Amino acid sequence: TCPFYKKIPGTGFTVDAFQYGVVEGCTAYFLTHFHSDHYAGLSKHFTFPVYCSEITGNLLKNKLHVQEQYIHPLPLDTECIVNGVKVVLLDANHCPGAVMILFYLPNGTVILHTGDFRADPSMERSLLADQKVHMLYLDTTYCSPEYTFPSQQEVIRFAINTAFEAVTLNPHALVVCGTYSIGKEKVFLAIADVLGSKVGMSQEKYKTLQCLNIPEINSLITTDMCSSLVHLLPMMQINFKGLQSHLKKCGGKYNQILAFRPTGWTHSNKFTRIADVIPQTKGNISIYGIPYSEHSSYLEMKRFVQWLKPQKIIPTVNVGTWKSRSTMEKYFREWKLEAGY
Template sequence: MRRAKTSGKPQSSATGRFGHSAAGPAGPPGWLPEWQMVPGTNFVVDKFGRKTQDSIKCKSWFLTHFHSDHYQGLNSRYKAGLVFCTPITARLVQQRLKTPADRIRIVPLNTPLMVEGVRVTFLEANHCPGAAMILFEPPGAVPVLHTGDCRCHTSMQLEPCLQPLRGKLNLILDTTYCQPQYDFPLQQQVLQFVLEAVKAEAFNPGTLFLFGSYTIGKERLFLEVARLLQQKVYVSPTKKAVLDCLGLAPEYASLLTTNDSEARIQAVPLWMVSLKQMARIAKHYKGRFSTIVGFQPTGWTQKSGVQDTERGRASHGRRRQKGTLIVYQVPYSEHSSFRELREFVAWLQPRRIIPSVGNDSGPKARDMVAALRPA
């Protein structure tokens, strides 16, 4: 998600914006968002632009996952320092961005390592494949958990390295959906809704199913549907190359094809799942498919009125139809709902919360933090 810019005004605290002591690491320049430099260290997270590379004296850089708003600045000419990331993210960075292999350090999940004297542990973020939360434990400083982009889940409360740090660390938190109206269902519930919808629509052999996705992300829906129907799913050659980096289980990998004549299920860019775009696709497949059913999997569908008015909570999806074109808006999100954010904060009890999305370094940020703290 797009990150808000900071105001650029330094804080007046004697310990600096990150709580660094005079003897600790120097604070970042005012233009660098505080959620992209780890307090107590000189580490930069998800910020690789030329200005950052030229201005920050940093040897160790961290990439939480392979989404463009996080890796922007990484390319074949990158030489600023070592980039630490998960195996899947590393394969994608090398394949798609051509970043030199000697600039990348692969870090498996749940495998602590020492980086410049700081204990660093990558943890499952429940976001797109390869995404990680990163726990930093600088000597003599407050530990920091940087969530990157994440979908909080109760399983995170079982992480052995987090349990002893409850109430003792600072939290840099993905606040994409930090508003009460974003109370969408669990991923598994939405997935089940989609599977049932597909079964209900699949009676017609002339139905083409479209599933919106990103370069990486939202794969679970179309892979599970393909497995359920035991049918091939078409992906573009570019998407196939990305999926090959994920190490998919054979039961899923065997269902992928780059020949659209073999499949009635297609993974397409999310923007293509709209009545306007689907009408164009219908013309392309005239004579082969008589109906097109598209799925829009994103938490932003909440803004479009996907509500269960009787319970006052999010429904699992909404069906819209125009002639032979059908769109399902489903709140399948790979970011935390507002309820999940509050539950995670209540469990972790961080000393400080630093929002990483929508942070204006002012009233908006303070309101988000206040909303996340249990009353």
Template sequence: MSALIKAAAVPPHDSTAYHCLGQVLDGSPRQSSRKVVAAFPVLEWLHNLGLAKYEEIFVREEIDWDTLKRLTEEDLCSIGVTALGPRKKLVHALAELKRHEGNPVETPDIQNVVVDERNKLATNKLITDYFPGSVARRKRDCISAKEQKETLKSHPSSASRSQQKKNRINNVKHKTVPTWCCIPGTPFRVDAFKYLRRECSHWFLTHFHMDHYQGLTRSFCHGKIYCSSITAKLVNMKLGISWDKLQVLPLNQKINIAGIAVTCFDANHCPGAIIILFEPPNNKAVLHTGDFRFGEEMAKIPILQTCPIHTLILDTTYCDPQYDFPKQEAVIQFVIEAIQAEAFNPKTLFLIGSYTIGKERLFLEIARVLRKKVYVSAAKLRLLECLEFPKEDAQWFTLNEHESHIHVVPMWTLASFKRLKYIANQYAGRFNLIVAFSPTGWTFSKGKKKSPGRRWQQGTIIRYEVPYSEHCSFSELRDFVKFISPANIIPSVNNHGPESTRTMVSHLLA
């Protein structure tokens, strides 16, 4: 009865709500439940498999539920799930998932989606921006929280199971804030939006990558968010955070926040990424690197040369001697030469992989050196416009795909030959050779030679993996630690507890 009353309260112009409610009221809950599955959280799925340690990789690669279902074993290898045990476990679970997707009697947990839906739709939006239709479809398909509550009332057994899951999610929400998100001697948090607390009102965001802003939504009401000008624009545009909640931090200029000196520097990671120096009154300075790549410019920063750093919170993405990849310049040169070598065929399409933001320097350098425009989608161009490129750089981007045979595409679309064949079919007639470049540091691991690129070919598709990384290689990490010589190091990536901290720190100091 209550569901009927709610139905009457829905405004007549809200056709989406009527459509969803119809599914609940017409006695076909299974149909609506199947659609709810589309938003089931990937991270929860990983957690349930006991593979939570791969959470960061899945977040970094922006794998949403739709993408997850299409992952192949080859994809898993390429994103860094290389160990045989977990990889096979995932392959098996993916096969199970696909099997269940076709099963009409499944009854997924609705309450779980009530808790996560608001965040998930926002975070999934980034990857689906490249395919705008899927966002609209997803919005149509989802059931509003209000409607889900009504569904729960009519399914008490589902509600009790749901409550268990809700409790588990609440436990995750209230777990201790990791040490690498806290700045000792200050009331500040860094990249800690998964752990929002009322008692903190100063939230720093080092850059606009999902694994750093995860948890930040339009409803943020916990004080101020401090970040660079570029990151602030992206947070405003992509997450809908209003400007009154954002405070832009200037670069290379000491400012005072809540009585603490704060200075930011370019992190040489994605556009807008900063490393932050905090100088609290206890004279124990803390340097938080966010994600970064150490280079000559950073080594010239005077305050980093002179200020004694007590605690270094360090991006340890590649804190293992096996990750010794070349400098970005060497990889850019390799890609340019490869394009020149493959371009003997005028019907060649070059694809350059890119994250939502990240890898811009690579395709910009290619355009500059070859004096050729690169095609980007309208959604990508809107993002690029936030990145404060000078006019002479922005002129190299075009929305007209016929104006360029170098196209910038989402990284995951290049992850396997299977996907590339799909792209090749779409371009059949116009191009007869596809040359794809996947720029990521993950491609180089144990046993592989330190080289600026590797080439594979299947018929008319050529795929290069190039170790173009926006994180420090292991040797750069060691150089940086030597340069800063901190009293204390807190690894911020792949830190699973005291043992992994000890291992990483011993690698760095060896």
């Protein structure tokens, strides 16, 4: 059964609610982004209206084969009427195609659902500037002060400099990058660009990337692994055994691998600055874990919420334990007393 924090009161609407069968009273199902925990349930057999971005729509059609007649793509930054209710989709600064949804309820209440997001000061100059929000449904993935990490720009600077230095010292090194979902494409794109290479990958991953409206993509990726010195592999293969095995397949072209495992936050962020990061090494294989986040840090989250000044907050992440729920409620009250709303 569909939980409360996925229902939008006073509408026929749900958000990221595809794993509960037919939801009673739902006339339109919104999908914030193409991550599996959120789309869980959609397929070619789905026959209700799905509302989403253009990019999410391309992924639904080509990867899950949802029929075209039930996909309703909406433009961003544009007031749209759905089943008699005004809605707006806004860029979430998460993975490609990810949105926040603003709902203007018939009774005058305004609701913002962030989906998954990485809060940024640029959001303070979207269509959010213009008006009040009564209820915020918030991505609280990293809602505690221990969760610190660098900007995406600093992380990419570290990865480009690391890869360019290695391959210039050794022209016979291969670079490998792990993936298991969409998002974080800047990691492997920026490395390939500095090295003058296309990125090589499986047919299944190439298909996924071709749905993402990235400019000049045909110039950046390929399924011809032999032509490429930056390869993508599933994230489960980013270990010494999986990498050894991959190097065997490359026909004596390479004599070293440098690999990257983009993660979220890890507890080494407590102690070690991005500049000071070192790899794990065995023989001619080295593996870097790099903290490239597509979710708000605690400080980014706090800034956003203190700017927006919502009347009520409903968390959408870490909701399963009493200790998590209590911790989150404490921080929301500090933020409110500090800022005066």
